[PDB]
Amino acid sequence: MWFEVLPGIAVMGVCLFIPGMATARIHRFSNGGKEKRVAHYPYQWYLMERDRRVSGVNRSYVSKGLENID
Amino acid sequence: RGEYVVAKLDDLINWARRSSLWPMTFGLACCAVEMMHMAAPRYDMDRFGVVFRASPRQSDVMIVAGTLTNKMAPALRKVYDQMPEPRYVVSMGSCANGGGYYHYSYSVVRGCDRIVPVDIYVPGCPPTAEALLYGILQLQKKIKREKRLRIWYRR
Amino acid sequence: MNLMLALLTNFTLATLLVIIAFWLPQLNVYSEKTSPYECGFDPMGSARLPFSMKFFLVAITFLLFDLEIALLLPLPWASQTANLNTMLTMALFLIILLAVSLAYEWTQKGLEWTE
Amino acid sequence: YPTKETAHWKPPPWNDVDPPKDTLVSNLTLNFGPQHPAAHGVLRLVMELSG
Amino acid sequence: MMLYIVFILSVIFVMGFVGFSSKPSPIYGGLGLIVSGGVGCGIVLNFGGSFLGLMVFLIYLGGMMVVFGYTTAMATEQYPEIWLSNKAVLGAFVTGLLMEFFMVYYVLKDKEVEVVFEFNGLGDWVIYDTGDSGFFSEEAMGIAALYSYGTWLVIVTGWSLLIGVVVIMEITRG
Amino acid sequence: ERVAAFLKNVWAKEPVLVASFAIAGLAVILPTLSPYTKYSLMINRATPYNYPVPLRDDGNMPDVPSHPQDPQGPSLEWLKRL
Amino acid sequence: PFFDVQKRLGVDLDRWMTIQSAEQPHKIPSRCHAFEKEWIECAHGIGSIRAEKECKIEFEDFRECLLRQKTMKRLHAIRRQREKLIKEGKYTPPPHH
Amino acid sequence: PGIVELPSLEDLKVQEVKVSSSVLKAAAHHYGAQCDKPNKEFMLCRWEEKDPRRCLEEGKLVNQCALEFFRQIKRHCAEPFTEYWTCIDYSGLQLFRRCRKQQAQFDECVLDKL
Amino acid sequence: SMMKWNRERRRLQIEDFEARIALMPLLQAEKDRRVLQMLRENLEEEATVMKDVPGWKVGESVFHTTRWVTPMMGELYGLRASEEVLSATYGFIWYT
Amino acid sequence: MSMVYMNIMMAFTVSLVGLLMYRSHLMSSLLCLEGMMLSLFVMAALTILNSHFTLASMMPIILLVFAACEAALGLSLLVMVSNTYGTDYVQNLNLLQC
Amino acid sequence: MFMINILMLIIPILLAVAFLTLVERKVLGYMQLRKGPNVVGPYGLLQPIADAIKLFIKEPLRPATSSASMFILAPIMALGLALTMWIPLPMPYPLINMNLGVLFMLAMSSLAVYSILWSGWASNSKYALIGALRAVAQTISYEVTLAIILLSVLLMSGSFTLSTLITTQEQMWLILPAWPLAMMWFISTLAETNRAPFDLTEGESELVSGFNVEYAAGPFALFFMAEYANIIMMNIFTAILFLGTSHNPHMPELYTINFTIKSLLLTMSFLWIRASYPRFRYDQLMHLLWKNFLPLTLALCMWHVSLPILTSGIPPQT
Ligand SMILES: CCCCCCCCCCCCCCCCCC(=O)OC[C@H](COP(=O)([O-])OCC[N+](C)(C)C)OC(=O)CCCCCCCCCCCCCCCCC
Ligand SMILES: CCCCCCCCCCCCO[C@@H]1O[C@H](CO)[C@@H](O[C@H]2O[C@H](CO)[C@@H](O)[C@H](O)[C@H]2O)[C@H](O)[C@H]1O
Ligand SMILES: CCCCCCCCCCCCO[C@@H]1O[C@H](CO)[C@@H](O[C@H]2O[C@H](CO)[C@@H](O)[C@H](O)[C@H]2O)[C@H](O)[C@H]1O
Ligand SMILES: CCCCCCCCCCCCO[C@@H]1O[C@H](CO)[C@@H](O[C@H]2O[C@H](CO)[C@@H](O)[C@H](O)[C@H]2O)[C@H](O)[C@H]1O
Ligand code: SF4
């Protein structure tokens, strides 16, 4: 019966779901729990590079808030 | 243990080869009509993993389905030679088996096994589609018995 | 770096699959096996002989049309211009001349293959 | 001024048309079958093709 | 080593040029032009022109597809020549590589080289701009201006492409 | 009458080309009739890709604001209502 | 131009793209904008024969901006003198460098 | 052709505004209004003078106003602001439209208190 | 539907662009000090490396004009680790 | 100049020599013409991109457009040459010595 | 951590490709009143594994007349480029975020054609050559229309960035304002992927196997894996272009599920179409695109330039 085609579809579906889920979770793991910063334009790269210096640990994704202004 | 490993590796390659048999799209005469009926929905040879492919480079089995004449003999041997190995030949029907109704003709090869080695002989004129399927399953069980790695280990 | 690493990984994965494909299986090479395929009989003439192209004129037109899209692909950016009166006129002008050239080649039977 | 290196030069055609070369552009010949899905397995259709 | 990325790609650029300039079978010449077009796209992209680099690659891929078709129709022989098959082709090929290899060897050794004219070999990054922080791509702004500033360019190019179709129809109507 | 006689014929024989010309005609024509076309250029002008360099107050620029929140200078109230 | 129809008709066909200090989209300046402006304004109206000598300073600076040959010569010299002292054990770069 | 006059490392010293771009973006609109005067005096100087060396003093007043501006937020609206820029920082594009709720809380806080 | 959504997307782009305009003065002031600091450091370590050279004068301009000229990449990062040079030259282009 | 210019100028020269030193196939020489234009595109793009000549960024695109018109023109003549002689050999085009 | 991400992209791609072969044979089978593979593993679930092992232990052949280097190169290019097509795909986050992702995909699709041309030519056999030259005609047929179809859609998105298409379609699928383009795009992807009714470069019933007739075992498998990978990738591209999935930044896996379902169904549609129609003649394919899609695509391109300007709905550049 036609529903016996479903098992192969589900296997195909799980495999195709993995790359999207993996990319999203590796981005959070590698960027301190947040989305990876997107820098399509030089301004965005400039700010990200400034965040690297500001972090004090050479990571553009370590944020500094009010506690860093005396 | 080396023997245990090569025994299990033989099972894997034997399983893979018999589970995925691709006959060459090669038919000669009436017997090819029953071969067509094996692909048809009632028997659905595809459900065993048996898929026709036109190119000899992508074929694992030659089903000689019909009379082989002298004029055709060099062509059949050519496409057999052009199959990569391992390769198998199934002889289908009396004509291919030994000449059949035309055994005494001046223009007929008295059995395709004068031209190519044959693994399975399917009798009938024509064999029913089910009889040919029985012959293919017999070919599978022959492949399952192969001991290439076991013999290599003991060389 | 990420881009070069991704390309290297893909084409290395493909190369490894070919290396395994050639070195793992048992081979048995002889002349008849490796002969060119032509449905059981030996080929008549080299496969390197000239092969007439009946769509040769469409093929040349493709070159001209394939450069038009290079001129058109900037249109999403050109639409951000403040001078939208000029931009819209020149965008429509370019596409119409492409249509006129197509209509000319069509009416002159350039799109029919040589028989 | 005739010279040895131009002894083989002929005046051009009166109307600028040189005769068409007798060169033969050979048609490609193809074995269509017998082993072919559309040849019913036993037809050796020898076809001359231009393209 | 990565700081010399443009140099490395430019070396492959020349190697592809030596490829098709030695003139083997046009099948392999087209291959050499595709490699050069590919790395050429990489060179221009590394100077901030992503759109220019991808466009030249896209155009030349389409062009070499047509050349391939025309080659099998009008520029083929029984034994198409690879670079090793012909003595003239091999000599040009080897000569190109040796001239290239010696320019590379000496420009790297001295961080400079005189090949007719003087070229500095400090690495190509040294000339780059130091202060970018706009919210747009300058190459995209310049290219998009074709439709506002380049009215005259649009007219002459558009007209030439239309005439081009008219002309190739005339030229090939025996 | 010939307006409909010709159109009906092409509708029957080449509806693809009839649709193509009708769509192309609307592209050329509607932009000159639309009342919303004028805002396309205003929105493109109101987009500030560049810094707005201040002017040296020389003592007589009433139309220019001293602070970004002063009543002078262009406003985008029309844009909030679009 | 051999025939200056652009001037006669007051139509701009191509001179908008002749120089890099002309009006650019969104007022993006070229890297050598100041240098070329200074050269163009120095040589304006006096003719090439005079401009070749009387605006030599402006043109040389503009050429240096364009190709940076003198800067690259200078940096090539400093980098060479550093490797001379590194191998001879006569200089340690600072931490910040 | 001359020695390039550079300010000494001592002259280039100022207390930096060491916060991340998400913090700067979250406070940008209010910062644009509160620190307009020194900011626009620095930008007039840079564009007229065309020399970073000729606007260092104006640059420091930009920094000093920034620190004063951020100290007011810290004193009066620390928690509402920390929530707001934390929301901005999550986004890969740092989009305003994903944090209108936290923005409203921050906006009303600074309005009431300052 | 697309008309309304693209209008709102344009109003969002303006808000995003204006936040940048608010911060540009501070970013510009930071960039000027950083550039001048890097150039000053380059000058300190030019003197030591090139003290012994016969005809050298430290910090000499290549330009006849005394006008401020924006340094090129080699001028600013000329004597620094490749990691910092590679990030400053190709970091943006190579970022995914 | 910068070292990239050494290889781009070299690539142009290689293709120019390739163009001027014919063999038999006319298609091979047309390829050398296309290669010459590719080096000019890259060489022009580098200059324009590095100098931030914003409006010149369209110039390389215009260069490609007339490159295709030349290639299409070259291929059109190759078709006629091939039709006449059955090869694209350039030694067949020697009728006009006389 | 980036290398791990690469592997978590291409290992699943190849597994999905393997089980797409099973799904096709079952879907075709039931549409043909039969079952398809149901013996090798339960419901045929081990059948792709058997075929893969079979081919890679099969003897690979280098034809006597073939050009050796190009013969090997072409299958490597085919699979390598097929995997490269996936790196800018936002699912919802791309592996590589590109400003001009669409243009990158166009360029890489053009380069993948050369794996057909060179394999066919390097085989030095007549059916292989005929297959390769059919690929030249196929590319000439669809490539110009394919690019201009994308352009018309991107005039609503405002950028060449694949992730922007998600933002563009947050309120409504682009299939609504551009279903004529979706129609023509969908057909163009069948031609682009050499899929029925445009399976001409292989054309089994005509050319035996066309461009890959001389390929066996592992080298042949590379071509099969490439084509089936491109079929899935082009339907993901179609889903992003026209059936944009909403993206919640805090629950990115809801996007992935919804987007994966859409891409699967579009892939099932490819198999469905294969089961339903006869094959085109390859000159009739060229006339389909040039005489029908191109005149309409040019007209719609004019319309989609004017429409944003006349409705004051031009999208943001960023
Ligand atoms: C998506 C990719 C899918 C890849 C699938 C990979 C297949 C996975 C299953 C592997 C099963 C094990 C391989 C057995 C098949 C070997 C083919 C065969 O039947 O030969 C029979 C032959 C039989 O030889 P024979 O000696 O008995 O007789 C042949 C000689 N005449 C003709 C005279 C009789 O077996 C062998 O020769 C050796 C068997 C060794 C088995 C172990 C294999 C080791 C692999 C290393 C090979 C070296 C090259 C490196 C390749 C890369 C390594 C991974
Ligand atoms: C073979 C040659 C073919 C050549 C074909 C040329 C067709 C050109 C048709 C006209 C295209 C532009 O049409 C014209 O667009 C501009 C803006 O875009 C419109 O202008 C309208 O919007 C702009 C701003 O967007 C306002 O400045 C203007 O006040 C307003 O009227 C015109 O009202 C319209 O007439
Ligand atoms: C602005 C872009 C949109 C506008 C459309 C632009 C493209 C216009 C295409 C050509 C239009 C006229 O040119 C074309 O002439 C030929 C005559 O041989 C006609 O073609 C004729 O023979 C061919 C082949 O049998 C078929 O298309 C058709 O059966 C018949 O009409 C076309 O019907 C007509 O369309
Ligand atoms: C198909 C064939 C393709 C052929 C491709 C040919 C590519 C051309 C080769 C270019 C090699 C460039 O080589 C590059 O030279 C510079 C020299 O400063 C080296 O850079 C060097 O700089 C500093 C100097 O202070 C050293 O301390 C450092 O150890 C070293 O890396 C790079 O480490 C090297 O990678
Ligand atoms: S064996 Fe019988 S059925 Fe088969 S081909 Fe011969 S005569 Fe026909």
Author numbering:
A (entry chain a): 1 to 70
B (entry chain B): 25 to 179
C (entry chain A): 1 to 115
D (entry chain D): 20 to 70
E (entry chain J): 1 to 174
F (entry chain b): 2 to 83
G (entry chain e): 1 to 97
H (entry chain X): 1 to 114
What does the published report state?
The density in the Active-1092-i map occupies a similar position to the densities observed in the other classes, but a smaller additional density feature is also observed further into the Q-channel so that, together, they resemble density observed in the Q-channel of the active-apo (inhibitor-free) class of bovine complex I in nanodiscs (EMD-14133). The NDUFS7-Arg77 guanidinium is ~7 Å (slack) and 10-14 Å (deactive) away from the bound biguanide (N-N distance), but only ~4 Å away when IM1092 is refined into the density in the Active-1092-i map in the same orientation, indicating that repulsion between their positive charges may disfavor biguanide binding in the active state. Overall, ~65% of the imaged protein population is disrupted in this region, and disorder is observed in all three major classes, as well as in states with (e.g. Deactive-1092-i) or without clear binding of IM1092 at the Q-site (Active-1092-i).
It oxidizes the NADH produced by oxidation of carbohydrates and lipids to maintain the redox state of the mitochondrial NAD+ pool, reduces ubiquinone-10 to drive the respiratory chain and oxygen consumption, and pumps protons out of the mitochondrial matrix. This proton pumping contributes to the proton-motive force that drives ATP synthesis through oxidative phosphorylation.
